[PDB]
Amino acid sequence: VKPNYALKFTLAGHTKAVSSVKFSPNGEWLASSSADKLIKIWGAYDGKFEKTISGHKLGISDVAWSSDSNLLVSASDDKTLKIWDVSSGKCLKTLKGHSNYVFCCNFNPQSNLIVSGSFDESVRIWDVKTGKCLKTLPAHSDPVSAVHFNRDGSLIVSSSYDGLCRIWDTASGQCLKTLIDNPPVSFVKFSPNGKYILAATLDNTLKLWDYSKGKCLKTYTGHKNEKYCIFANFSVTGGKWIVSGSEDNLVYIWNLQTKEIVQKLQGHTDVVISTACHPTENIIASAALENDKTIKLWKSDC
Numbered sequence: 001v002k003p004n005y006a007l008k009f010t011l012a013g014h015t016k017a018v019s020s021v022k023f024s025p026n027g028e029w030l031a032s033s034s035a036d037k038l039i040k041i042w043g044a045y046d047g048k049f050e051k052t053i054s055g056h057k058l059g060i061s062d063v064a065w066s067s068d069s070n071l072l073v074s075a076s077d078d079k080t081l082k083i084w085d086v087s088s089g090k091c092l093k094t095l096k097g098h099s100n101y102v103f104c105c106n107f108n109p110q111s112n113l114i115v116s117g118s119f120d121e122s123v124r125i126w127d128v129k130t131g132k133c134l135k136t137l138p139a140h141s142d143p144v145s146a147v148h149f150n151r152d153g154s155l156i157v158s159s160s161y162d163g164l165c166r167i168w169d170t171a172s173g174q175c176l177k178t179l180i181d182n183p184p185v186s187f188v189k190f191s192p193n194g195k196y197i198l199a200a201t202l203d204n205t206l207k208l209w210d211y212s213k214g215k216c217l218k219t220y221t222g223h224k225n226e227k228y229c230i231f232a233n234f235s236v237t238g239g240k241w242i243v244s245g246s247e248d249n250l251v252y253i254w255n256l257q258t259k260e261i262v263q264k265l266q267g268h269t270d271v272v273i274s275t276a277c278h279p280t281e282n283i284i285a286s287a288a289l290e291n292d293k294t295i296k297l298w299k300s301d302c
């Protein structure tokens with residue numbers, strides 16, 4: 001079994017590299033952030049441009065949706081995060097505290113909290129309602145490349161250029177495990193069932209780790225990844241795949257269990273820095289850096 005993702009739409013509008021794309025949890029929208037300091041919202045199914053959201057004073061590295069699809073948070077080189085009301089485009093809150101670029105962000109599933117990671121080597125946990133920083137974790141000794149809550153919000157996983165992946169208790173901020181401890185760990189994400197962690201290292205390697213046992217279960221290679229932090233994903237709407245961007249301008253798709261490459265999606269003209277999987281349909285969004293600046297939507301039968 002192999003998917004057959006085919007290109008359906010190319011979305012143009014950003015004037016610099018696109019940094020992150022994310023589907024809304026209700027499946028209706030794709031949000032994109034860019035070095036051009038803008039967030040753009042597009043229809044997830046037909047790619048139609050919906051709106052531009054502006055306000056950050058420097059480029060944006062990352063965006064994330066609340067579970068009810070009504071809020072976005074963005075992480076910017078202006079050292080803030082901003083919380084946006086998607087319907088109005090208005091900035092509801094500016095989250096101040098980080099002392100260097102904010103690189104990565106995520107709501108918890110409850111969406112009462114935001115987690116952020118920064119070039120200042122800290123992980124911060126923010127109250128969505130008030131905009132106040134609740135906790136600052138001295139999480140790493142180099143820039144934080146990823147922060148992600150698990151499926152019930154009780155855990156946070158972080159990764160860093162210091163070579164480490166750490167798992168944190170949300171409630172207390174205490175470190176439960178140092179899972180990886182070494183080249184930079186450029187990306188980390190919990191699996192949908194929370195039992196595994198997908199971890200990228202800047203040596204052409206993606207690894208599936210059993211979080212409870214602390215053991216690498218699978219290794220995925222083939223893609224080019226020596227420079228950039230690239231978003232990877234568990235695709236679960238059809239076959240069980242691993243999806244990643246790549247510095248050779250392709251989207252890579254692997255069989256999660258066999259580790260074989262099952263598809264490479266060709267079309268982008270620069271580094272594919274971001275991929276995202278639709279919540280209910282076999283749809284992938286990909287986005288590329290400044291020689292391309294587009295977002296592409298792909299569809300598969302499985």
Ligand SMILES: CCn1cc(-c2cc(Cn3ccnc3C)cc3c2CCN([C@H](c2cc(C)ccn2)C2CC2)C3=O)c(C(F)(F)F)n1
Pocket residue numbers: 017018019020034035059060061062076077103104143144145146161186187227228229230231273274289
């Ligand atoms: C501010 C506007 N902006 C930000 C980015 C952006 C976006 C992503 C994708 N990303 C966002 C959050 N999570 C993920 C996976 C990865 C990177 C970057 C630029 C920085 N770097 C490297 C780097 C990262 C770190 C942590 C430390 C040291 N170097 C640097 C190139 C060597 C990335 O890899 C872009 C752009 F154009 F590249 F898309 N524009």
